[PDB]
Amino acid sequence: LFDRGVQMLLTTVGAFAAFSLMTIAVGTDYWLYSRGVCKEEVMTHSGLWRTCCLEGNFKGLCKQIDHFPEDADYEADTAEYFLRAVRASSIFPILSVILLFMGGLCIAASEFYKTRHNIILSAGIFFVSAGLSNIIGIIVYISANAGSYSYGWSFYFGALSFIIAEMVGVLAVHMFIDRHKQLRATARA
């Protein structure tokens, strides 16, 4: 919003914070506190991959989440199968992590060969896309679950990553706006 040295470091720390938060959200299985079989019905702390026992006979026993149940699953339309495929593979949260890493590499690459102003625009586009991918991942995860509960800290770690990704994306595009302003200012003079 002002100066140049602060904006670069602020974008760098924001990108790193978003990347670490989204990696933690994907990596840690605290996404939904709900009752379910952890191996009787018992409160469990779930994630994207493996739902794990909590306050039960054998706490700390972790089991992978059943995404395609067997034993007469009754089937459904191809849309529901696609939804389970996206939920199980988590292509959108993983794509968000990948886009955050690519934006971080682009921001880091701005120090070398600073005359290529399109790298900043590339970083901004990548951060905005990472935010959109996080949005799609959250919507898909909630829709898949909807088929008492409360969300863990990793879900809100991911939700906070989307906010920071868009906030950094705004600054990244803003930095590109000023860099082209610098070109216009010197060209006239």
Partner: protein, 232 residues
């Protein structure tokens, strides 16, 4: 989660509109859509309120159109669900009679395990009374309770899921006892009476018979009942 995703979508739409309206220097500016103006446009679009600006580029107009469609659907859904909530709440009818209780099954009802009230249902010829008897005699677990005192606490314990059938005099008194969480509904199923008992051939038969009639007409009996049921 719908509200959370509405907030997230609003932020994303605002950021995308700002990006697609400003990032290109070849459009430098020609549009008053900054990050502050983009958020204001998105907020005004969601509230279906007038906007001081509209997007002019193809990408900005695409963003505006999809946001407008999303907003229209969401507002329509909110109004429709509010209407459904209020309407369904409006048709809620409390069970205010024995017929209403018979026609339903969510609220369980039972009687004493041994008494005059239980036997009245078994030997009954009215349509509603026999229907109630069929329901309780075939139900698991048994709705009948051995004692009234235990059954009275069952109504309070079952948070409205269990209903108790008992004498109206005890129903009115129990309703007036602390914590006064239970109430009497509907009308009396049958008609009984409390009488003063005297031995056959006793000399106190006729005077007591005329005494009871005297107290009823002058209002002493009605005054006595109200004193120990409502005043106390």
């Amino acid at each position: 989660e719908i509200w959370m995703c509405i907030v997230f979508a609003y932020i994303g739409v605002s950021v995308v509109l700002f990006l697609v309206s400003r990032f290109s220097p070849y459009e430098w500016s020609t549009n008053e859509f900054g990050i502050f103006n983009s958020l204001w446009f998105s907020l005004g679009a969601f509230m279906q309120q007038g906007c001081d600006i509209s997007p002019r580029s193809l990408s900005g107009r695409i963003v505006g159109g999809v946001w407008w469609f999303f907003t229209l659907i969401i507002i329509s859904s909110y109004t429709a669900n509010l209407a459904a909530f209020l309407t369904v709440e409006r048709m809620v009818s409390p069970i205010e009679s024995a017929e209403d209780l018979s026609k339903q099954t969510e609220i369980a009802y039972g009687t004493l395990d041994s008494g005059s009230t239980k036997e009245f249902f078994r030997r009954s010829k009215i349509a509603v009374f026999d229907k109630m008897w069929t329901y309780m005699r075939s139900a698991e677990p048994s709705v009948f309770v051995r004692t009234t005192a235990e059954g009275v606490a069952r109504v309070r314990k079952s948070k409205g899921k269990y209903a108790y059938l008992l004498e109206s005099t005890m129903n009115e008194y129990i309703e007036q006892r602390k914590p006064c969480d239970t109430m009497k509904v509907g009308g009396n199923l049958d008609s009984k009476g409390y009488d003063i008992a005297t031995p056959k051939g006793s000399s106190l038969g006729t005077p007591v018979n005329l005494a009871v009639l005297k107290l009823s007409e002058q209002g002493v009996l009605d005054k006595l009942k109200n004193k120990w049921w409502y005043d106390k």
